[PDB]
From a paper:
Among these subunits, TRF1 and TRF2 each bind double-stranded (ds) telomeric DNA as preformed homodimers and thus associate shelterin with ds telomeric repeats. Here, we determined the cryo–electron microscopy (cryo-EM) structures of an unbound human telomeric nucleosome core particle (teloNCP) and TRF1-bound teloNCP.
The telomeric TTAGGG repeats were suggested to be unfavorable for DNA positioning on the nucleosome. (A) Cryo-EM reconstruction (2.5 Å) and (B) the atomic model of a human teloNCP. Within the DNA duplex, the G-strand consists of the G-rich TTAGGG repeats. The observed nucleosome positioning creates an asymmetry in the DNA lengths on either side of the dyad. The newly resolved extensions of the histones have a role in determining the binding site preference of the shelterin factor TRF1 on the teloNCP.
Author numbering:
A (entry chain H), F (entry chain D): 25 to 122
B (entry chain F): 17 to 102
C (entry chain E): 37 to 134
D (entry chain G), E (entry chain C): 10 to 119
G (entry chain B): 15 to 102
H (entry chain A): 37 to 135
DNA sequence: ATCACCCTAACCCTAACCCTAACCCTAACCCTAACCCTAACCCTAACCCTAACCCTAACCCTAACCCTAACCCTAACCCTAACCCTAACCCTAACCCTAACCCTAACCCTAACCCTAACCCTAACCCTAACCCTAACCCTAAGAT
DNA sequence: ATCTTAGGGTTAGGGTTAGGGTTAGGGTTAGGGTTAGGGTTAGGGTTAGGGTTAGGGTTAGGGTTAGGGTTAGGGTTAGGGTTAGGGTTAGGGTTAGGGTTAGGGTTAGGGTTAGGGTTAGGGTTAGGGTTAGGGTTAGGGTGAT
């Protein structure tokens, strides 16, 4: 009955993305830890800004519009442009599948 | 209805105004090349703040930039401002 | 012959004068024109509340005054009394701006 | 009597988990409600940034003639890219080191 | 049937509103639940900080021979106290000005 | 039927505290605005830190203990000491009257 | 029975002159004055104290006697120095 | 005479060597003792994980290296190549650490 | 090393004006009381992770010595910024006018929440072999003379 | 051109860890039911932008000049490079015990809802604190002795 709680991470998805961008390259454990930290940091930044945006304008819901505005506020120029493009494409594809 | 395009307004920040701002910062003697450098610095700062203010304004689906938009933009730049409805 | 103050006397008098007061040191209308010119690049046919332009002016003047204090320290560090563009550049570099 | 389950990540054509991001948004006290398209957008953005950094780090790793990415390669990738450097300007990377920079005035005269 | 109401501020011996603070905590998306003593503690701390600043600002106003407090007095109070200056290091007070300070090297030699 | 929404402020309470500390002293409109900004700023800081503390320890409730720890984190030495003393005193008095 | 502790004295001198030289070399410093070392130690001490204080605060809030890596990570994050590679 | 490098040659060599590497530059045991000593006044009888001490060491070394880069810039501003305590103090004042 | 002379900021008195503080009404928000349910406390047990200790061997630190080059101080100069004055121009302030715009109210509907079953994905665990590190050797470019 | 040295390139071999493969349990997804947050339309106050006039305070440009920044030279001391001796840290190992964490059982504290009473916000008004203007005066700067 004494079983430790499980701990989730982004290792699987980071490895998938790595195998897309560089088919031959591998990654060390420490570098994977760095990538998990990075993903958590960015998630928190974007989610916090979206929360503040919703509160300022007296809305109860976080929608993709708040996410887009937060992305535009937090990322520098070309990064923001490309990230917005990727987000809009993903949402459009998701909605197109009913 | 008609709106007129503005240009080269950075020269409106005159040499005496820059000298006054330097005086409040306790500067005694000023080189002649400071004024152009200062204009560039102010330009960069203002662009950065106004872009965020306009992003906040557009998210709300408004056309008028309010003081709260500026306050939020400054706050997220790391420069909190008191006295304008914070 | 007519009275004439030595160089630096009036500068010290001005320092004492402007550190004692609180008014804005930049003319209001030129600053407003500058704000409108800068903003017209991001979006066309924008409008501004008066308090918005006033808040911008307060922030800008505070920023420049702080920068000049740091620049003065950098100039004094180099056994000088005159501030030069390299002093501003150094101060901004150390602040993390450039 | 029910249609075979498809992941929301495959519906959006992503590698990052849309369902997990949805749960994290719901549990993180960010708002009362979360829209259906917020987790998709956020997952897409996170995936893009991850791919961004990983591509640059893989290039750096190949330059030093190595097969794995270590934190040094991540550090080099971040600090040699202007926008990634700006985004992560206040971040320390463990076992990353620094960029090899020496001031010009310090170099010998001849 | 019902006893006469007492404000929760009066029970804690405070001037700041315990009820309003409690509501702002419940509606701020800070946590799922809010304890009974959290708003009391927070209101007390806010009142303390307000009183500290106001005492120093009143002294500053009296030094300039004024009845009312203006933003200049608040600025002088904040910047002349080490702990309040540290707490508000990244804060700009509108129409506050700066402290009079001239570097000793700039003063006339003789 | 078309009436503007009410605006809340801490002006009533700030005035009460001012009359406690300096009975013969007033305050201008601008100074009161600044005081409002200060109170809102400090509220946001403390509440955010308390929320993060509750999240780290897997707790669903913000209690006086979270507020105490947040105060100790966010305030300098003597400020934190006296603020903690005031908070504890107030909570004790509140509990004493059933 | 019970494992008692012992006190520690004068460990700031454990940060030696060679170590400070190496740290300056990674920072690109070519020539070093003799009075730097003392200065450096002071600076370091201050930094450490602040971080450690915050960390201990976190540790006390959870009612633990052991300072973990996450306590340090949170303490650093709330001072504007985010650290990757130890969790979070 | 036996071979002798001129002043600054070994300094440049060391700069290159230590900018190429990533390992820690402070000895682990003395740093751990310093950490425990500093912590002993905030609370008595504390325990530390190994990773906590490693995290502290990483953060401290990164901080010091950054400060040394800024100090070097301040020293070069005054037409010197030798860093002095006044350079550290200027860098810390401008950074906002007020020293 | 005072001293005459002269400019500037500060101090004082008076009219006046506009901004603050007091008052009144009222709608909304806080307090009280009854009810319910789940987060948090508590006590036990279980494993496990840190502190304490011994050994040892190589490696890093410390101190002394020799020397050079970087730093600091002085004098000369020359050019650049401060100070002052005058002509003119552009900001400021007060006023109006209107169209754009922001806000509210009523309406309603669809997107988000909630619960349940079941099934697919991800974390924990095992095991192997391939990338990385170590040791010995040789070239190779750069430093000092 | 010449000797010398330190980092880098090559090869053979060990060994650590990253990557692939199982298994299970729990977290995501599909399906159905409910409700209130937000989107839509109309209307109405309000406020920001554009135009006008007048004047007077501020800016720009030119002339005079001193003193501060720049440069070259000379001395000196302090920091760098080197070497031998010895302290001390890094690594390996073991032990035990105090500390962290899960698991089952309670309970009371916090959320919900409705009704009613208090209080804080909005709007109006008088008067006094602050400000503008005019007149001394006290302090401090500047050239001369």
């Amino acid at each position: 009955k004494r079983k430790r709680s499980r701990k989730e991470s982004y290792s699987v998805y980071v490895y998938k993305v790595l195998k897309q961008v560089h088919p031959d390259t591998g990654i060390s454990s420490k570098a994977m830890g760095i990538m998990n930290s990075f993903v958590n940091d960015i998630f928190e930044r974007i989610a916090g800004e979206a929360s503040r945006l919703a509160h300022y304008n007296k809305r109860s819901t976080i929608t993709s519009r708040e996410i887009q505005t937060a992305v535009r506020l937090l990322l520098p120029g070309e990064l923001a442009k490309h990230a917005v493009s990727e987000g809009t494409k993903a949402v459009t594809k998701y909605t197109s599948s009913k | 209805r008609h709106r007129k395009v503005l240009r080269d307004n950075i020269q409106g920040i005159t040499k005496p105004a820059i000298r006054r701002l330097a005086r409040r910062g306790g500067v005694k003697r000023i080189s002649g090349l400071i004024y152009e450098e200062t204009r560039g610095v102010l330009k960069v700062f203002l662009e950065n703040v106004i872009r965020d203010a306009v992003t906040y304004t557009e998210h709300a689906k408004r056309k008028t930039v309010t003081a709260m938009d500026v306050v939020y933009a400054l706050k997220r730049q790391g420069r909190t401002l008191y006295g304008f409805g914070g | 012959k007519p009275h004439r103050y030595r160089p630096g006397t009036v500068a010290l008098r001005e320092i004492r004068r402007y550190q004692k007061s609180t008014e804005l040191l930049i003319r209001k209308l030129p600053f407003q024109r500058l704000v409108r010119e800068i903003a017209q690049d991001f979006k066309t046919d924008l409008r501004f509340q008066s308090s918005a332009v006033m808040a911008l002016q307060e922030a800008c003047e505070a920023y420049l005054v702080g920068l000049f204090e740091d620049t003065n320290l950098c100039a004094i560090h180099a056994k000088r009394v005159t501030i030069m563009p390299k002093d501003i550049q150094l101060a901004r570099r150390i602040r993390g701006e450039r | 009597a029910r249609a075979k389950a498809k992941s929301r990540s495959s519906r959006a054509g992503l590698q990052f988990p849309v369902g997990r991001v949805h749960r994290l948004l719901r549990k993180g006290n960010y708002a009362e409600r979360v829209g259906a398209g917020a987790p998709v957008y956020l997952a897409a953005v996170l995936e893009y940034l991850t791919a961004e950094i990983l591509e640059l780090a893989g290039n750096a790793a190949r330059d030093n003639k190595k097969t794995r990415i270590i934190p040094r390669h991540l550090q080099l990738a971040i600090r040699n890219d202007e926008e990634l450097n700006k985004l992560l300007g206040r971040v320390t990377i463990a076992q990353g080191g620094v960029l090899p920079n020496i001031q010009a005035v310090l170099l010998p005269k001849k």
